[PDB]
Ligand binder design. Structure first.
Ligand code: X3P
Lengths: 95, 290, 68, 188, 44, 129
């Protein structure tokens, strides 16, 4: 049914998400965002970047490039990206 | 321009240069070196040396081979002459440099020194394939080469698809058309999603049907449809599967075969649309001829 | 692939013979960690955790009381 | 509080050391990586062929299912975690002790004041003010994206004879019979 | 802001001394004492 | 330099500038508070978000549509699917393979060694030799 080409585009998504969780947080630490506003800010901007990724790079068809796309873009690698955001936010708040 | 890298690596992992005409092979040889020395960025060392040995084989195919010795000298530096690629390369070098057969014996006992698994199994599998390639030319031509493969095949290495595929090709060329079905079925067994072993396994059944009785003809053409439908199911723009389905259904011409004829005609007009290049000329002829 | 197309389209006659249980179980595996290890001292609903959000009661509110 | 320009000499060396020891760990696991008769590999190969004809080739062999089995039966019959994190805790507790490094942006609970402020012997300082070890406790969890971005990557005969006798009529897969329906189920 | 910051960088660009300017370790203690409030006048 | 690396360098410079300006502004809100005995937001914010949006567009404009060269022919004839990623359904994957004149099974189909020996013995005879 499916081939072993999902790994490549999955890796591209992972690179995009990783590179969009260490400039968020750093920006938050530059603005001296406080405890809960920071988390709400991160959730809003991170899901916005996921949506614009679904629109722009993926051509409005999450299927045909991932299987179960709502599971794979949004919920997968979410607790591996809140923590990188926390690291960058702590690094930014201390400068 | 990295698109040339894409073309070269596709030719590499497909080994399509083996099936090249001398004109396009000369074009490949000429256009290799310019990128080889110009576009040196983003290309890994292993790909560097793989391209080097592809150029070695291209030169050995080509008329002049002094650059073959030069390239072999450049590529000798890493992993010497004990790697299976290097062993095959130097065996070919000694076969072509003087048209002397001697390399075989310096290979032969080498195979008899590899029984103790000093290297991987793919190593001396490849060495066995090359020495069969040597010996089919040493005694110019015979059917016994198939026998050699079988005695090399059955005890030692069933898994290798390439050997069974060459056995099936030799059987199909002038031999029996029945054992080729078994060989292709095995090649299908090892590689589950091969979409070109179903086209061959349908073509061989079609060829077996054309000289059969009417009930056996019906059975064989039914099996050809059931085997070509998987080439349809594993690829959309695959030319030969669609052409074969259309041809056999045209030969039968039944009502639901007529449905398949309409669908296959639409798909073959899709293939012969000018997105595809030089496969339109072999699809449109079969479409508009009859 | 013109060659095979040509040889197949025409005629040739030549030969030579010669499920909710998983959810509940994963909930138990999610709840064992909470009960056993995070509930030692690292969870609120203790009174010693809402102390930094309590008021002072502003005792005097009209008085100064200077002294020596 | 008013801390004085010790952010650099604590935050930057710790992050550099974690990145470099991660790279060294990857290289060392690469170098360390964490049958001799032909008959041995031959029998292993035949065993694997039986396995794949059970799983891989036992799907689209509709006519050839019966013919194979006679031939088959006749031929057949955590240091990585423990070393570097302890070493880094040792180094951090040696070089960086009795300091206040920063304040976190989010309020923890008081047991985290117990865990994180080991350097200082005060009693009401805060929960949000942390010693240097806290910077390690976060940098362990959050360094995965940085590692990704910089570029990093990750006796015998009887049993299979019994399964050979088991697989005779276990499942003849309905393939090369229903394929016309599935082709006509799509490509519309 | 861009002009003043870039001119400040350009003026201090020269005077290796670059690595020691990056070091920020190398000092007069009077500014250190005045920054922490250590320096004071006691009126008796 | 095309748009992606340009936007990386510009984003890095803008973010560093905004970070230094925020460092300066937030340092003299405690020092200045101390100088009074314990007694530029908008432009800085807009600059910082401009840098962030530049970085995001620099990460998104690093994707180029896939364009190929045919294996057989020698003219350009760029065979473009107009896609950014690679399909997961095996039908479309083998489709994008078949539009190029190659076959992924490769060695099993061509059996390179045997036809290699036969053709390299053949190549001596032909006219280009
Ligand atoms: C390990 C990751 C760090 C997570 C820390 C939580 C950060 C969110 C947070 O600050 O919420 C705090 C954490 O107060 C507490 O410390 C109680 C924790 C409540 C969550 C427990 C989860 C089981 C509680 O909400 P609050 O409205 O009562 O506090 C006052 C408002 N505030 C100043 C916080 C804006």
């Amino acid at each position: 049914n499916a081939t072993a080409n999902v790994v490549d585009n999955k890796k591209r998504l992972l690179f995009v998400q990783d590179s969009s969780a260490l400039v968020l947080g750093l920006v938050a630490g530059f603005l001296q965002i406080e405890s809960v506003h920071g988390f709400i800010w991160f959730l809003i901007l991170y899901n916005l970047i996921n949506v614009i990724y679904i629109v722009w790079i993926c051509q409005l068809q999450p299927g045909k490039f991932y299987q179960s796309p709502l599971h794979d873009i949004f919920f997968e690698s979410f607790f591996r990206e809140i923590t990188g955001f926390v690291m960058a936010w702590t690094f930014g708040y201390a400068l | 321009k990295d698109l040339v890298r894409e073309k070269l690596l596709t030719i590499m992992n497909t080994k399509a240069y083996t099936q090249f005409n001398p004109e396009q092979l000369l074009q490949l040889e000429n256009e290799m070196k310019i990128y080889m020395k110009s576009g040196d960025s983003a290309l890994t060392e292993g790909n560097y040396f793989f391209l080097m040995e592809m150029l070695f084989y291209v030169l050995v195919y080509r008329n002049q081979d002094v650059d073959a010795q030069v390239v072999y000298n450049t590529l000798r530096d890493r992993l010497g002459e004990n790697s299976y690629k290097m062993v095959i390369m130097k065996a070919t070098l000694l076969q072509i440099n003087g048209n002397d057969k001697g390399a075989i014996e310096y290979l032969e006992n080498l195979l008899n020194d590899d029984l103790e698994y000093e290297t991987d199994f793919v190593t001396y599998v490849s060495i066995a394939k090359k020495l069969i390639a040597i010996k089919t030319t040493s005694k110019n031509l015979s059917q016994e080469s198939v026998l050699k493969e079988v005695v090399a095949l059955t005890d030692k290495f069933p898994l290798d698809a390439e050997l069974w595929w060459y056995a099936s090709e030799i059987y199909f060329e002038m031999g029996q058309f029945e054992k080729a079905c078994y060989c292709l079925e095995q090649v299908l067994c090892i590689t589950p999603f091969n979409y070109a072993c179903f086209g061959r396994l349908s073509e061989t059944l079609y060829y077996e049907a054309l000289r059969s009785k009417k009930q056996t003809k019906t059975e064989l053409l039914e099996k050809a449809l059931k085997n070509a439908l998987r080439s349809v199911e594993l690829s959309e723009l695959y030319l030969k599967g669609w052409a074969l389905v259309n041809i056999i259904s045209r030969e039968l011409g039944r009502n639901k075969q007529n449905d398949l004829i309409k669908l296959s005609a639409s798909k073959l007009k899709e293939i012969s649309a000018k997105s595809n290049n030089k496969d339109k000329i072999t699809a449109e002829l079969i479409l508009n001829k009859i | 692939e013109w060659a095979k197309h040509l040889l197949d389209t025409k005629y040739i006659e030549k030969y030579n013979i010669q499920m909710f249980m998983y959810i509940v179980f994963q909930g138990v595996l999610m709840y064992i960690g909470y009960r056993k290890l995070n509930s030692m001292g690292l969870i609120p609903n203790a009174k010693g955790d809402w102390l930094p959000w309590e008021r002072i009661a502003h005792y005097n509110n009209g008085l100064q009381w200077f002294s020596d | 509080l008013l801390d004085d320009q010790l952010k650099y000499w604590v935050l930057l060396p710790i992050s550099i050391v974690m990145v470099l020891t991660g790279v060294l760990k990857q290289y060392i696991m690469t170098l360390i990586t964490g049958a001799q008769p032909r008959v041995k590999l031959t029998e292993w190969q035949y065993l694997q062929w039986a396995q794949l004809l059970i799983g891989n080739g036992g799907n689209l062999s509709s006519d050839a299912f019966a013919a194979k089995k006679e031939f088959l039966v006749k031929d057949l019959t955590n240091m990585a975690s423990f070393i570097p994190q302890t070493i880094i805790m040792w180094w951090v507790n040696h070089f960086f002790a009795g300091f206040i490094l920063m304040q976190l942006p989010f309020p923890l609970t008081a047991k985290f004041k117990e865990m994180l402020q080991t350097g200082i012997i005060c009693q009401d300082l805060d929960v949000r003010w942390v010693s240097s070890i806290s910077w390690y406790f976060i940098s362990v969890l959050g360094l995965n994206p940085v590692y990704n971005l910089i570029g990093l990557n990750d006796q015998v005969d009887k049993a299979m004879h019994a399964m050979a006798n088991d697989l005779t009529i276990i499942q003849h897969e309905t393939c090369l019979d229903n394929v016309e329906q599935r082709v006509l189920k799509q490509y519309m | 802001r861009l002009t003043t910051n870039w001119n400040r960088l350009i003026n201090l660009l020269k005077e290796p001394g670059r690595v020691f300017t990056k070091l920020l370790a190398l000092k007069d203690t009077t500014v250190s004492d005045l920054k922490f409030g250590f320096a004071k006048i006691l009126i008796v | 330099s095309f748009v992606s690396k340009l936007l990386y360098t510009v984003s890095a410079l803008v973010l560093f500038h905004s970070g230094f300006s925020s460092y300066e502004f937030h340092h003299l809100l405690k020092l200045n508070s101390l100088n009074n005995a314990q007694g530029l937001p908008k432009d800085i914010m807009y600059e910082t978000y401009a840098g962030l949006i530049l970085f995001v567009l620099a990460v998104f404009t690093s994707f180029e549509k896939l364009q190929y060269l045919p294996i057989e022919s020698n003219d350009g004839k760029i065979i473009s699917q107009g896609n950014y990623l690679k399909e997961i359904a095996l039908n479309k994957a083998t489709n994008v393979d078949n539009l190029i004149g190659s076959n992924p099974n490769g060695e099993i189909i061509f059996t390179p060694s045997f036809v290699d020996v036969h053709m390299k013995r053949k190549i001596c005879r032909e006219w280009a030799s």
